[PDB]
Each structure stands twice: as C-alpha cells, then as structure tokens.
Amino acid sequence: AEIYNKDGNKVDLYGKAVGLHYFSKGNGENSYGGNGDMTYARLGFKGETQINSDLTGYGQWEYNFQGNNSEGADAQTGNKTRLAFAGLKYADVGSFDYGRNYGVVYDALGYTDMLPEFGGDTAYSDDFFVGPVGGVATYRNSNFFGLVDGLNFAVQYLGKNERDTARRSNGDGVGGSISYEYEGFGIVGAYGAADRTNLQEAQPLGNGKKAEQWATGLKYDANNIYLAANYGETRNATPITNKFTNTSGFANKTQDVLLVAQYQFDFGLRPSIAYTKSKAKDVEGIGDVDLVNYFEVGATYYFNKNMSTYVDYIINQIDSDNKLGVGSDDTVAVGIVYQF
Amino acid sequence: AEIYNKDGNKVDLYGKAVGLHYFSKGNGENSYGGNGDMTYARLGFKGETQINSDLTGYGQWEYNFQGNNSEGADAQTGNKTRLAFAGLKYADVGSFDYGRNYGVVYDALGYTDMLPEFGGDTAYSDDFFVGPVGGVATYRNSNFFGLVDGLNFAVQYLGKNERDTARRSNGDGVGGSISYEYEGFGIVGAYGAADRTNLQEAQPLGNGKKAEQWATGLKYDANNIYLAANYGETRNATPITNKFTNTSGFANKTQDVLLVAQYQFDFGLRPSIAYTKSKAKDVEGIGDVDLVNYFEVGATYYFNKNMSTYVDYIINQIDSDNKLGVGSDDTVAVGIVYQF
Amino acid sequence: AEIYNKDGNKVDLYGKAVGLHYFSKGNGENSYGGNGDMTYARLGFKGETQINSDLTGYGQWEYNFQGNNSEGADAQTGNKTRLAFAGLKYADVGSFDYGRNYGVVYDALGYTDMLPEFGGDTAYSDDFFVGPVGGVATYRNSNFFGLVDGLNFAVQYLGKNERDTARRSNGDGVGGSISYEYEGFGIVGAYGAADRTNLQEAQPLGNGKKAEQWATGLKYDANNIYLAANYGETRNATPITNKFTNTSGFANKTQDVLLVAQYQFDFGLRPSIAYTKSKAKDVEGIGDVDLVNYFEVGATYYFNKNMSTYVDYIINQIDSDNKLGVGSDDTVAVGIVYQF
C-alpha cells in the first residue's frame, strides 16, 4: 500500500497474511509438498525517489515470517530476508542495483512461476543465478537505450559467497539475459556461469569447477490468457540429496521443462493447468533420475485486489522407485490470502 | 494506527515500545516473575477489505521483538510471531479464519486476562486451546445469525502439530464456545478436547491419550467498573515441570480460578485487584500441588490513548515448600508504554 | 517517513535498504573490515504523542535485518533490535526513558561517529556505557531547566545484565554527561562506572571489580564544516581477544583518540578525513598493544534526502606484528543507500 508520497519520495509498505494448509497422506515425508499448517506472512517496503527528471533512486526489502512455528524454541524457523537492495535508474541509460536480489536466469524462469501455491521448482534459493541470491550487482536496460521498443537485457555480477554450507555457497560469476516483447508475446534467453567453492567441490555428488545455468522462455500474455513455457539445463548447479545414503551435492546435469496455461475469468476465477519435469543426468551412482515430475490443476479466485483463496493440486508423476528417494505422493494446498 | 484507507481497503499498522523492569529478590529464580530488564516491542498489521456490502476479507499479523537481548548471540531470544491469519466475514452468516490464532477456550479466559503486567496464568501458548496456537480454523457466529442479539458461538478445529517438543505439540481436536452478553453482563462457556501426540505420551508426568480444557466466565462490564471471574479445569493439558527432578509433562488434572476487579477513574487511573490460583491434582509422585497462587494489586494510569505507565505487584501465596519447586517470592513490575 | 499524525499522535515509520560491499585482500581475515557482501536493511518506528502542552510521551524501536545471509540456516545471522524504549518529556524539567538505548558516554563519542561506513571504533555494543545497552534508565535535561541556553546534562542508571557471555554482560552502574553548545561550538564530558559480573571477572584478560569509561569531546559544527575530536580512556571495559591464544577479556586500560574533518559541498558531496587510534595498556602478557589505528579518506554524495552513495577507505596503520593479531590490511567500502 502506498503509505507515503511527498517531496518526490513515495514509500509503499506492503505485505500479506496467508492462512495455508497442505494435505498429503502419511507423514507427508513421501509426498510432494509435505503436510499440515504452512501459514505465513510477509512484510516489506518498496521506496522510490525522483532525484530529478531523469534520475530515480529506489530500494526494497521484504521479509518472510513463518506463521506455523511455536513461540517456543523453533519460533524463528523459516524466517528470512528475501530481498534487500538499493539502486538507481537513469533516463534511457538503464538501472543498476546491488544487494540480495533475483539471479538473472530467473528472468526466464519467471515465465512459469505462476501456479497458485507450487510451481517454479527449478528457481532454487541461494543457488547461483536461478532464485534470490546475496551479493548481486545488476544492470538492466529497457527498450535498447530507448532505440528499440520491447528489447531489454541485463548483465549480472555475482560476488563470491562462502557460507558454512556447500548448498548455500558460491564463487564469482557473470550472467546475462535478453528478452523481447511484442504485443502479448515475449521471448527470453538467460545464462550464467560461476566458480564453485572448495566446499562445493568437496561434496560427494557432482563434479566440476564451474557451475552453469541457462533457460529459455516463451509466452503469450493477453486476452485473459496466460500460456508460458520454459526449458533449461544446468551443470553442477542443481542441489540434490540421496535420501538413502543421506549423500548430497549437485546434479552433474539437468534438463528442465515447465509449461503453464491459465485463464482469467471476468468474475475472478483463474483456473491453472501446468506440467513440470526436471531430470538429473549422470548423477554419480544412480544414472538418470527425475527430481520433479507432475501435473498441476489449481484455481485461484480473486474476491478483489486484497483478498483471494485457492486450491493447488499436485498430481505427482514421480514413481515410488525413484533412486534418490524423491517423494511420490500427491499434495493439495488450500489457502486464504489477505494482502495490501 | 490507520495508515491506509482507500478503495475499500484499510490497513492499520500498529505497535508499541514497552520499557519494562521486574523487581524480585535473589536471582529471581525463586520469585514469581523473575527479575530485571524485560523491555520489549511489538509491531503488527490488521487489514480489512470490503469485497462487497455483505462480504469482508481480513488478515492480521503481530510479532514480538524482545528489547532485552544483546545484539550478540542471544539477540533473537524471545522473538516470535504471535498471530498470523486470514479470513472472511459474510453478512449474518459468520466469519471464518485460519492460521496462528487464539484457541477457543481463551474466549473464556479472556475475561480475567486484564492485569497491568501479569495475570492470565492459565492461558499458555502452544498449549491446545487456551492461548495462541498454530493451525486453527475458526468459525464464529454473532447474534445467532442475526436472530438473537447477544448470543454468539464459535467452533474451532485444531490441526495436528508435531513439534520437536512435547510442550509445543498437539494432535487433532475440536473446540467450541458459547457466550451471552446482555447490557454490561456477559457469560461464557468454552470447551475443547484433542489428541495428544506420541511424544506428549512419552513424557514422565501426566497420563492419557486425550487432552481436555474447559472454562466458564462471568463478567460485569459497565460504569467504569470491570469485575470478572473464571473457573476451569483441564486434563493432561497443563504443562508442569519438577524443578527438583527436572522432570516434565502435563498435569493429570487442574482446577483453575481467576478473579479480577478494576475501576477506571475519569482522570486515567485504573486500580486493579486480582486473585489467581491454579492447582494440579494427581501429579504422578507429588499428589496435589499449587502451580499458581497469589494476590495482585496494581494500577495503570493512562496519560492518553498512546501513553501509559503501571505498577503490577504480585503477592505470591505459593509457599517455600511447594513440591514442584514453583517460586514463592513476590515480583513487582514497573512499566512505561508508548503505542500507536 | 511521517506516515501518521492525528489527535496529537504522530508516528514516523522509517528505514533503509543498504547495498554494501567490502573490498580487502585475502580472505579479509587479516584486513580491517573484512571482505564481501555486507548489504543490510533497517526498519523502525519513532512515535510521539502530546499528552498536553507540557507533557510528551514517546517511544522508539529499530531493528537490523542483515541482507547477506542465505535463506538457509544462517538466515538470522546479524539480526537484532538496536533500540527499544519509551519515555516522557515534561516542560523544562527534562526527559526520562527506559529500555534498550545509548549509554551516556556515547554523548561524547557521538561527535566523531560520522564516517561514511566505518569510524566510531570505540562505541562498542553491549559494552557498558559506550554504545547501545539494554536496561538503561536515562534522565536528560536541556538548557539547565530552561535557565541556561546550551547547557545540558544527563545521568544514566544501568541495570545489571547477566548474559551467558562475559562480553555481553554487566553489573549495575551509574553514568553522566554534561555538554555545552554555543554557536557552532560544542564541548562534552561524559563518564560512567559499573560493577563487573562474576563471569567478566572469570576472564583471562583484564583485572578488577569495576569497569570505567570516560570521554571528552570538542566540535565545530557550522558553515558546511564539521570538525570533531574525541579522547577518552577506559579501565577493564574494552573487550579484546588474543587471536593467537584465542584468549579473551577486557583491556586493563585504553587511551582513545578520534579526529574527524568533513565539508559539505552545496552540490551534495561530503568528503571525509579521519584518524582513529585506540591502544591498550598493561594487557596481561602483551604489554601495550594497538587495537585500532588508521586514517580514513571517504566521501558521501547525496543525490537528495532519500538517496546517496559513498566510498569509505581505511588506510590501516596497524602493523603485521601486532601482538593480539589485530588485522593490518586496508578495507574499502562502497555503498548505495535508499532511505525514508
């Protein structure tokens, strides 16, 4: 909500309270999304200040507050800062920002990250260029310096992040994306490569000294219709765990496919139909293994711009004999969202 | 404070900074409330959006920020999300919400949870239906579908919560309350029963496979006068700890009594007089033991609706020979509260 | 930003998103400030309510959200409540507040805590009266009861804080400051002494049963010019660690000197030049050791009151043979700040 706007500075304080619950059989250990209370809330700010007609400064922070913890010991479980960055936009020259933000490859994966509760399986956090990552300096250009309507690009510099965990770490790397949008149509290509850390290399699964990720996207966005498709691959970037051996590391290679079709009815109902499949190749020991594989049927109903509810249903296609131990059961999410 | 209100949506951002300090002798280990700095702050939001004349959506989140930690390692100690839920209200049909909220039995205990700093000893957190609990779906009806002024009820469904701790866990259960309010008078009856988890059953104290809690309340609220009384009992629900053996579990049974009398002077002074007593029965090994037992004298002075100060004084009646080791010393709380 | 102001109560919700990065060679283990992503954000509130013409109530909370953590396990690292207190101001009688706030000696050290990213080396947190501390009751008088323009003082009572760590703990103590400001000039003298806890005394470094800290300040603040100087000493208060022995405790004695010169150009550029030096004396085993020692060259450029960027550069004078193991490398901070 725009709670402030004076002297060229306007702050928008925003957030939401999400009553959320997952239904899956058993202890949801073997299901797709788990089972039980998954309620949570968000709070963040987006500020923008007009330094002059061409120059704009801005910043943004968003935090995630789990609503399913006890006020006991586990109280902080799941809590985190999702985004935190500041930057400047200058006329038709482009924008630049730095801090915790979205890796460039997400410029592609964004296309299909549209399901009501699930979806976007490949956009992992603290995983190089696919989801939010800390320490990214991002330059973005729109309409090619104002000379080409619809042509945009971005280059992104990832600063080394040596965390206590191979999964949450990264070396330096560069990434970039180009996309073009012409009347309801949009196409994107994004790519990034980075160094792996000593610890990432000390892991049992995956072999290499460089991590890679690229994805292409295609979309048709107009007339209440949203159809999107993504395809990408990765090298030693996708984190995987052998539930049997309790071994961990990164997939040597993956080929990912995401499809999403949705329609927005005038009365507020947005039915969704999607398909996701990510398969690892050359996993040391297993060979080829599916990591994600399912159909999605779901629907969101918007009471208005502040209230909505939805049922997301995962028809898991992974089979009970999956070598990594990836879960094979279905999961049904039901939620009620208020937001401002 | 109502920081936003446009297009049928109004957000109220609220909070407070509480400078608080406890005075009790010794290391306050043997006192009622402890001793020392207990300063803390709250921040939360309450949103409400009119979907149409009969339909209302809403959500609420509140967080607790301890103000007595070091910015060092212990920095997060005590911090937590207290409430987080979203829901809808429809004409005279009733409201429904889900998320972290107040158990239904609190509809009763609320009556006496009115002391300046202490009080409400039996409304424990993450303890089934008595205080805030995660995963509760709540239906509330007012004025009996609009057919009976003053008659309200609620039914509440508790979703199983399997935490690492028997104290912060719960199985599925149902609860309900009915209350009636007629001109300054109000009476309530609330009740809930739930399954106990394996871990709750693996505990040394308390024996059963079902937890119970019910409380009745009576009040007179009018003419600057507030008098309230509560009585309730519980079965295997009240958490207790043997400080000697360092044993823990739940009381097999408790009988709780709460009394509160207060008066609001025109100039801002609200003196308080209360009495609390909770006694456990059949505790494995000890027999009958008092858990809480004291008199309360306190006063709050309101400078206005945003500023106030108060002195709460506990005249602990527990005696030094209490078998569980419950503290016997007095505690005096002094506070200064700013809020918006 | 002043998001609320009605009925004599005005709330100011404030904060900032700071994209920040440190450049230092090696793994920055041996540098002054470290190396890498240091992005973070702040969020806080300052409320003020006019109880009547002479009486004002107020409160303030500020939190620090690290923007360089993974949403993984380390997610909360660095997060903390910086300030949290409530109080009252009465006509020309003075103000009083309690909670987590700034120790009185900071009334002095504030003078030089003006560098773009570094500086203020001696104003340690949870370290008695020099930085923020929990449990402080503070009385402040301005213009000597309204009888002496420019003459102010404060007395501050520190409540014992027994934390799990000798570094984050403290016993009871009193502190006070007096300062005088006459047309661009200002002079301050501050002092505080407190009891040390058993644990603080159980430490390997430093010897005594009372902690002391005093600092004097001098400043010239006018005409786009800011020149400030501080000098102070301490007894068993300054925390130190022997990186070789991994031993810790407090310096028996320190003599601290801070100098800062800055100029604000009309177009937004504020160049900074500073010098800091803190040296420990009588450290058990080492003798005299420098703790901090460097020159600072830096500059801040204000695009406006909401946006700015800066480069802080530490020319570390500490030498590679420093007995405690204090780092000797340079550090360059670059930041981009949005704020409201």
C198: buried, middle or exposed (CB in 10 Å: 19+, 13-18, 0-12)?
exposed
Contact indicator for A333, A311 with CB cutoff of 8 Å: yes
Residue A306, chain B, CB below 8 Å: the answer is yes
Handedness of CA A56, B10, C41, C156 (dihedral sign): positive
Residue B308: beta bridge partners?
B302, B337
At residue B3, the 3 state secondary structure works out as coil
DSSP A119: -
Helices (H), B61-126: 106-109
* Best CA proximity match to A189, nearest among A134, A236, A151: A151
Please state, in angstroms and rounded to a whole number, the distance separating the CA atoms of residues C84 and B21: 13
The count of other CB atoms within 10 Å of the CB of residue C217 is: 23
Of C45, C55, C99, the CB nearest to B15: C45
Bin A212: left if φ > 0, else alpha if -120 < ψ < 50, else beta.
beta
Helices (H), A72-197: 106-109, 143-146
Q: What would the DSSP string read from start to end of B45-62?
A: EEEEEESSSSEEEEEEEE
Three-state SS for A123? coil
How many domains is chain B partitioned into structurally?
1
Question: Residue B202 CB: number of other CB atoms within 10 A?
Answer: 10
Task: Say if CB C240 and CB C248 are below 8 A apart.
Answer: yes
CB distance from C231 to chain B under 8 Å?
no
Distance CA B201, CA B205 (A): 9
b/e per residue, B37-69, with b = 16+ CB within 10 A?
bbbbbbbbbbbbbbbeeebbbbbbbbbbbbbbb
CB contact under 8 Å between A57 and C305, yes or no, is no
Q: Residues for chain C: how many in total?
A: 340
- Closest chain C residue by Cα to residue A136: C37
- C90 closest CA partner among C33, C141, C18: C141
Q: How many CB pairs under 8 A join A and B?
A: 157
| H or E element in which residue A47 lies | strand A40-50
- Closest to B41 (Cα-Cα) out of B74, B22, B69: B69
Q: Which domain holds residue B325?
A: 1-340
Beta strands C55-66 and A331-339 are unpaired
Among the listed residues B164, B159, B259, B167, the one whose alpha carbon sits nearest the alpha carbon of residue B204: B167
First to last CA, chain C: 5
Q: Which residues of B touch A41 (CB under 8 A)?
A: 59, 61, 81, 84
Q: What's the distance, Cα to Cα, between the start and end of chain B in Å?
A: 5
Provide the strand spans (E) within chain B.
4-6, 9-23, 36-37, 40-50, 55-66, 80-90, 94-102, 132-141, 151-158, 173-182, 185-195, 210-222, 225-235, 239-242, 247-250, 253-263, 269-283, 287-302, 307-316, 331-339
Cα C297 to Cα C115: distance, rounded to the nearest angstrom: 9
Answer yes or no: do A84 and C37 touch at CB < 8 A: no
Residue A217 and residue A123: Cα distance in Å, rounded? Answer: 14
Q: C-alpha angle with apex B247: B242 to B249, nearest 5 degrees?
A: 95
Among C74, C193, B258, residue whose Cα is nearest residue A163: C74
Residue B128's nearest CA partner among B56, B64, B200 is B200
Residue A248 CA to residue A242 CA, distance in Å, equals 6
CB atoms within 10 A of CB A319: 10
> Please, which residues have CB within 8 angstroms of residue A98's CB and are 6 or more apart in sequence?
A85, A86, A87, A135, A136, A137, A138, C19, C21, C39, C336
Q: Is C64 helix (H, G, I), strand (E, B) or coil?
A: strand
Q: Which of C68, C76, C307 sits opposite A134 (nearest CB)?
A: C68
A306: three-class secondary structure by DSSP: coil
Nearest to A231 by CA among A260, A269, A194, A200: A260
| Residue A134's CATH number | 2.40.160.10
Task: Give the torsion through C-alpha atoms of A314, A318, A319, A324, to 10 deg.
Answer: -130
Is-contact B311 B336, C-beta < 8 A? no
Retrieve residue B74's tokens: 């212990």
C-alpha to C-alpha distance for B82 and B40, rounded to whole angstroms = 14
Query: Which residues are registered as beta bridge partners of A194?
Result: A173, A211
State whether residue A200 is helix, strand or coil: helix
Q: Which residues of B156-191 are buried (b: 16+ CB within 10 A; e: fewer)?
A: bebbbbebeebbbbbbebebbbbbbbeeeebebbbb
Interface test with C, best of B27, B37, B64, B300 (most C CBs within 10 A): B37
- Round to whole Å and give the CA distance between A13 and A59: 12
Among residues A335, A293, A287, A340, which one has the least CA distance to residue A315? A293
Phi and psi dihedrals of B243, rounded to 5?
-65, -25
Q: How many angstroms separate the Cα of C244 from the Cα of each of B220, C204, C240, C286, C297? A: 69, 14, 12, 12, 31
Task: Report the C-alpha gap between A174 and A162 in whole angstroms.
Answer: 17
A161 contact partners, CB below 8 Å, separation of at least 6: A126, A133, A134, A135, A168, A169, A170, C36, C37, C68, C70
Residue A23 with chain B: CB contacts under 8 Å: none
Q: β-pairing, C331-339 with C307-316?
A: antiparallel
B330 burial level (CB within 10 Å; 0-12, 13-18, 19+): middle
CA dist., res. C138 & res. C129, Å (int): 11
Put simply, the answer to whether C47 touches B340 (Cβ < 8 Å) is yes
Helix (H) or strand (E) holding C277: strand C269-283
Which of B16, B334, B336 to mutate to test binding with chain C, by most C CBs within 10 Å of its CB? Answer: B336
Experimental determination technique: X-ray
How far apart CA C159 and CA C171 sit, in angstroms, is 7
Distance, in angstroms, between C134 CA and closest chain B CA?
5
Distance CA A17, CA C12 (A): 23
Closest partner residue to C84 among B21, B27, B41, by Cβ?
B41
Under a CB-based contact definition with an 8 Å cutoff, are residues C238 and C291 in contact? Answer: yes
- Token reading at B73: 């390692």
Angle (nearest 5°) at CA C61 between C121 and B339: 160
Find the largest Cα–Cα distance for chain A: 62
Residues C162, A14: Cα–Cα separation, whole Å: 39
CB contact under 8 A, A168 and C74: yes
Closest CA to B289 of B244, B226, B332: B244
Query: Structure tokens of C317?
Result: 């004078």
Closest residue by Cα to residue A109 from A254, A248, A312, A241 = A254
C86 vs B contacts (CB less than 8 Å): 16-19, 307, 336-338
Q: Does B103 touch chain A (CB under 8 A)?
A: no
According to DSSP, residue A71 is labeled S
Of B19, B66, B303, which has the smallest distance from its Cβ to C81's Cβ? B66
Q: For residue B184, what are its two tokens? A: 């300054």
Which has the closest alpha carbon to B310: B124, B44, B118, B135? B118
Q: How far is CA B207 from CA B97, B238, B325, C264, in A?
A: 33, 12, 21, 73
Contact A161 C37 (CB under 8 A): yes
Q: What whole-number distance in Å separates Cα of residue A84 and Cα of residue A23?
A: 33
Give the C-alpha separation, C316 to C13, whole Å. Answer: 37
Query: Residue A281: is it exposed, middle or buried by C-beta count within 10 angstroms (0-12/13-18/19+)?
Result: middle
For residues C64 and C42, what is the distance between their CA atoms, to the nearest angstrom? Answer: 5
Chain A neighbors of C5, CB-CB under 8 A: none
Q: Cα angle at C156 between C153 and C161, to 5 degrees?
A: 160
Q: What span, in angstroms and rounded, lies between the C-alpha atoms of C93 and C140?
A: 9
Nearest CB to C3 within list B3, B40, B339: B3
Distance CA A194, CA A245 (A): 28
User: What does the block give as tokens for A31?
Assistant: 């299901």
Resolution of the structure, angstroms: 3.3
Q: How far is CA C267 from CA C220, C274, C301, C302, in A?
A: 21, 22, 8, 8
Whether B79 has its CB under 8 Å from any CB of chain A: the answer is yes
| Residue partners of C180: CB distance under 8 A and separation at least 6 | C150, C151, C152, C186, C187, C188
Q: How many CA atoms lie within 13 A of A3 on its CB side?
A: 28
Of C47, C79, C132, the CB nearest to B338: C47
Q: Which of C21, C13, C55, C63 is nearest to C38 (CA)?
A: C21
* Distance between C25 CA and the closest CA of chain A, angstroms: 13
| Size of chain A in residues | 340
Indicate the DSSP class of residue A2.
-
Calpha distance B40→B66 (Å, rounded): 4
Cα separation, C2 vs A59, whole angstroms: 18
Q: Please enumerate in sequence order all residues whose Cβ is within 8 A of that of A142, keeping only pairs 6 or more positions apart, or say none.
A: A92, A94, A152
CB contact under 8 A, A76 and C72: no
Give the DSSP H or E segment for C146: helix C143-146
The dihedral of CA B215, B220, B221, B225: what is its sign?
negative
CA–CA min distance B57, chain C (Å): 24
The whole-angstrom distance between A32's CA and the closest CA on chain B is: 19
Question: C-alpha distances in angstroms, B16 versus B123, C7, C85?
Answer: 22, 17, 9
Q: Beta-carbon neighbour count of residue B9 at 10 Å?
A: 21
* C-alpha to C-alpha distance for A306 and A300, rounded to whole angstroms: 13
Contacts of B57 in chain A (CB under 8 A): 303-304, 306-307, 338
Cβ-defined contact of B37 to C159 (cutoff 8 Å): yes
Instruction: Tell me if residue C269 falls in helix, strand or coil.
Output: strand
DSSP characters over B194-246: EEPPHHHHTSSB---SEEEEEEEEEEEEETTEEEEEEEEEEES-SEEEETTTT
Count CB atoms within 10 A of the CB of residue A153: 19
DSSP structural state of residue C170:
B
- Measured between CA atoms, the residue of chain C closest to residue A131 is C71
Query: Residue B104 carries which side chain, given as an amino acid letter?
Result: V
Choose from A85, A124, A139, A164 for mutation: most chain C CBs within 10 A.
Answer: A85
- Tell which residue, B129, B165, B62, B131, has the closest CA to residue A72: B165
A287: how many CB neighbours lie within 10 A of its CB?
10
Nearest-CA distance C14 → chain B (Å): 13
User: DSSP states of C204-243 as a string?
Assistant: SB---SEEEEEEEEEEEEETTEEEEEEEEEEES-SEEEET
- Whether residue B138 contacts residue B101, with contact meaning beta carbons closer than 8 Å, is answered with yes
Interface partners of B (3+ CB pairs, < 8 Å)? A, C
The answer to whether B297 faces chain C, any CB pair under 8 Å, is no
Q: How many CB atoms lie within 10 A of CB B154?
A: 19
Beta bridge partners of C316: C294
Of B136, B149, B65, B145, the residue nearest B106 (C-alpha):
B136
Question: How would you classify the pairing of strands A9-23 and A40-50?
Answer: antiparallel
Of C132, C159, C164, the CB nearest to B74: C164
From the CA of A178, how many Å to the nearest CA of chain B?
38
CB < 8 Å from B in window 12-71 of A: 13, 15-21, 27, 36-37, 39-41, 43, 65-71
The helix/strand count (H/E) of chain A reads as: 3, 20
